[PDB]
Design a protein around this ligand. Structure first.
Ligand SMILES: Cc1ncc(COP(=O)(O)O)c(/C=N/[C@@H](COP(=O)(O)O)C(=O)O)c1O
Ligand SMILES: Cc1ncc(COP(=O)(O)O)c(CN)c1O
Lengths: 365, 365, 365, 365
């Protein structure tokens, strides 16, 4: 009974994988696979339209927003957001809120297309969100960028930051549809499906329809929002099977209570793991400030704040023999990371909860 | 009993889809799905390395070449080829060989990144290939581009042109691994997997190692050849499932005799359909000249050289009744188009051949 | 599911058996079975003429050759060839090239009508074709006989030998129409139709029209080439149903690309098996020198050169459990033998190759 | 609705053609066709042994008699009988009785293998049997040959002739198993299956076991009784499907009363037509003497003895409108010939009887 705590690609609901297996050779009586299905056929037109309607219903996406499915992953949008939006104002300036490895990597990628100004002082360690009241915002910047949830460091926004009245861009790859979102506050929301809403190969991008037509000339057509929105994400061959998988995962989300229930499940799973760390008497330490602790990714150290390597490997190896996968923290941080996306059930978190209390009972003073 | 003549995405071998189904929940005893498999796991490392080895083995790729798997499809490389290569020489110039709709679209996209020079007069109709002795090639061009197989107009190269020593870029989306290729004579080879080596979502790129480090600054990192070769295509989350699907089709290709056998089958499949056209007494009309006729995509008309709309609808309606799918010609050309890719079997073409004979016998005057 | 690797009689195309089944009671509306059809009727003249034209068309038989259909099988020609041709020169001598079991049988049978001389030294094993330079040819011999393909030992000519201008008689029974043939180089070609062109009961004999009229006095009139050629194979009641079946198989070969396509298909098929043997690391042994390996019959042993009986039985027992018939080698040789004639499809050879690979993976020490 | 009066190949029972059609693709559930079956398999062993058992049962063939199945038809035995038996005595003589065209052909063919003495003077008209007591028999002759039923002239033996202890050979091709036979009185019986007991392609031969081993050197192996009886008709590939068809016809004759009932059913059929001729008052002319009239073939003329070409054409034209096929007389006699073999039912003959009665009533002067 494997329990997959993958960081991305992640666990998919067992119910969904069972339907993908059944329909793999004959999708709902059409006589062919989705892997063989044409993106121009009427069969796939209903698949991609259903996926889009499930994005607009679950997130309550206003009618003045375009929902498109592109390739290239989240790292692809690190280039797509500037190429499409850095030309909103003549200065070609952009403000970036760096709270972890991904918002940092995004700001570096944005330097290829203009002058990038980070809005706050560089944090010594990614352990908190700089107070937005201290944000040095440029009134001539084309947009403001920030990552809602840092998968490696465990820093998550529990608010939508006030950014004057400027265009707001948000990376929700690791917390997409984990909680309801007031979409109207955002200019562009993008998320890789391989984390919380499907399989790797497709990236959902929600754009306000007044931001189309500002893309730079060097923006590749397959990544230009205006081109891709005008063709309903069918400018070229899209990731057909990936969109079909995401729709089934989206269907699973709607059946289990929508975005409102996902947030409640994400509270229970994160709290039970955090309360084991807060009561660990120092044995488990999470360097993130309590007001910004991510509910999707929980990276922690064992024993001491610097990380007892001998104790961590024993934790990983004994978790492996218990069929708990991908608990090893990121390479650039080490330590332990526990990913608690939507597919991760509460029974799966309890196995991790009982295993962490028992491992502390056997190693702590 | 469905016979899928899809043009892209296209038919997959039935033995492959059977394995994808029984392993979909537990890949080779790992305990999870490939859809859940992390791209940083030991398990996916075997899959992506096995796919590369098969690309190198089946095509006999020399050692001085990188094999990377990118996202964005074929049209993604229409932008990635200039972004990475057009700065190879100081002129930012490039030569393109337009033989059909796909090379034409490729030249239009490359204009976003430099000065493009189409090396020949505009063909009144894409029915032939201009002789390469008559090519107005620029000695200062960064590369010479051409599409090996035109999927819409059925025009194919049965030779590697003499570009007078220039770097040669080739689009082999619709004939990749349908015949042996001398990889040494090319600078860059790319192909969308959704046509002949698997499913959509992944694009195989074969690059000569001395052509990295010339990418423009606006080139997105996920599409930069140097960045992805220096990461073995794992710069960000790659299309794991599409790479795993492509790996099986490559295994299936090697089991049926490799690229040398695919050329033998493509000749039998294509000739059995061209024979029916050449001996049709004008009932079936293929406008492509014989020296350039594609062995992958055969477009033709019925009734006359311009196409009897009544006969072509009766043809496509009865073809659907016989469970023969995606025979309808491309929206910009109409008529009929039969796609005979690798997975399309001889018993598939024979069913089509018998239907074309019975239909001509019943409707010719 | 049944996969028929029969040596002869062999498998017939499933489309041929399906048509024979539906016309068995009312052949093309005439109201009777072919089994009831008179050999003097207008309907059967159209049948036997169409069968002769297809033989002339697919093999490109010159106009100065007679195409006659006889009874008695190939072993019947072992007597009809001497009876008709051994009196061509007054000496009544014939030179024979023994390359396997069926050449020796034919050479021994010919000793009942004249003095027979084997042109090459007795080979210790039927594993290689003696170099035509080694042949000790009699300039007074009436003809020179050789077997194109040895069905029991797997030794095949991929050339027409030089016989110093003598009349060349060939036994192509087990490779008839598996490849194009320069008929102008031969004097007499015969082939039992039960191996690669039809069912048992009829033999096709192609004789140059000037070799008629040299038959001995003891030649039965039903086997005399001059008598049957003058009666269009209708001197007596011919095997009507066998000739009807043979015509349908000829039509199936023509619809699948004629002799040229059969050579391409027979190359892919035999390569699939030989590649397993050549890379088996001594687990499969094929004694025939690779330059003389048959593309129709692949005899081999399992374990060692002499063959491990315990392993070969387990192979055949498991193969029979998988509905793969007639894999047992010939009685005089034993071991394994795979017959891959024209009707044996690529998927059929793919089931066998996948089985041999798994069997080698389960028992290789 | 078709009434098949064929002379050979002839009508087969509707019951037999049906089971052949049902089992054509999967004989008794073994997976393959009889056309694909190997003559060495245990499946064909049951077929040929049952066909041998039925012949021995329906004719009461003693144990000292061999039953073999050859190729070459009836005319094949015109040469195989002398080749096997003309050397019983050193003189190489053979006594032949020429009562019609088929015994005349056999006598001329036998001259190729020895000196042939016709036992009676030329008849002038094949209308009677020369008295066996006036037969000029050679006491040193190797055998005595005679045709029991002359298919062209309608002259049948209703007795076994006394040849004074000579080895007796009989050509029962056109009345085989139409009546019981005292096999003990014969040395060799043979019959082409295509006239009374199946379809063309196979010949049954019944030989006393002490008449083997007298074949000349020039006899082909496939036609030597000693060779073929020693291998149980499996010296080479036998007409597998033609032997299988014979087994069903014999099984049909057994289910309908054996030879004893066929003789009495043949009496009803022939008496119906012969009486119409006798009472025709010269409108229908049968020149054969009543004591020697055949019960299988009834040749006659219309109008007068020499034949009215006008009436004989309208008879064959109106018979063709009524679907009464093959009623035209043989090429060497012309006129009309009705063949009343076993599968020809009483209901069939009544259609002919009513037609002849109506034609006479409409054109008799
Ligand atoms: C009594 C008897 N003996 C031998 C034969 C020859 O049969 P085959 O040698 O298998 O053709 C035959 C064949 N008789 C047929 C022959 O027709 P054909 O003259 O061959 O068109 C008939 O009477 O019309 C036969 O009737
Ligand atoms: C939050 C977040 N943002 C961006 C990315 C970039 O990944 P990709 O572009 O390959 O989907 C990731 C992948 N770990 C991520 O977790």
């Amino acid at each position: 009974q494997v329990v997959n705590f993958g960081p991305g690609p992640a666990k998919l609901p067992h119910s969904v994988l069972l339907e993908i297996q059944k329909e793999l050779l004959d999708y709902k009586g059409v006589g062919i696979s989705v892997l063989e299905m044409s993106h121009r056929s009427s069969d796939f037109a209903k698949i991609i339209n259903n996926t889009e309607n499930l994005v607009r219903e679950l997130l309550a996406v206003p009618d003045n927003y375009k929902v498109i499915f592109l390739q290239g992953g989240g790292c692809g949008q690190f280039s797509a957001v500037p190429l499409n939006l850095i030309g909103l104002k003549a200065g070609r300036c952009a403000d970036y809120v760096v709270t972890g490895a991904w918002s940092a990597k995004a700001a570096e990628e944005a330097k290829k297309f203009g002058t990038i100004n980070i809005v706050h002082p560089k944090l010594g360690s990614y352990t908190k969100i700089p107070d937005p009241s201290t944000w040095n915002l440029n009134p001539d910047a084309s947009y403001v960028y920030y990552c809602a949830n840092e998968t490696v460091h465990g820093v998550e926004f529990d608010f939508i930051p006030d950014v004057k009245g400027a265009v707001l861009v948000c990376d929700m790859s690791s917390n997409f549809l984990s909680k309801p979102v007031d979409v109207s506050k955002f200019g562009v929301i993008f998320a890789g499906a391989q984390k919380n809403v499907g399989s790797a190969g497709v990236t959902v991008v929600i754009v306000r329809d007044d931001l189309l037509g500002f893309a730079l000339r060097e923006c590749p057509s397959v990544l230009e929002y205006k081109v891709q929105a005008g063709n309903s994400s069918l400018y070229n061959t899209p990731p057909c099977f990936s969109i079909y998988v995401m729709g089934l995962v989206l269907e699973w989300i709607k059946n289990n209570g929508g975005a409102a229930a996902m947030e409640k499940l994400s509270s229970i799973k994160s709290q039970t793991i955090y309360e084991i760390i807060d009561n660990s008497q120092g044995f488990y330490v999470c360097p993130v400030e309590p007001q910004n602790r991510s509910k999707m990714n929980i990276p922690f150290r064992i024993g001491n704040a610097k990380g007892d390597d001998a104790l961590e490997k024993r934790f990983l190896d004994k978790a492996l023999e218990l069929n708990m996968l991908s608990l090893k923290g990121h390479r650039s941080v080490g330590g332990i990371r526990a990913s608690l996306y939507n597919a991760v059930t509460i029974e799966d978190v309890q196995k991790l909860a009982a295993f962490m209390k028992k491992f502390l009972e056997m190693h702590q003073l």
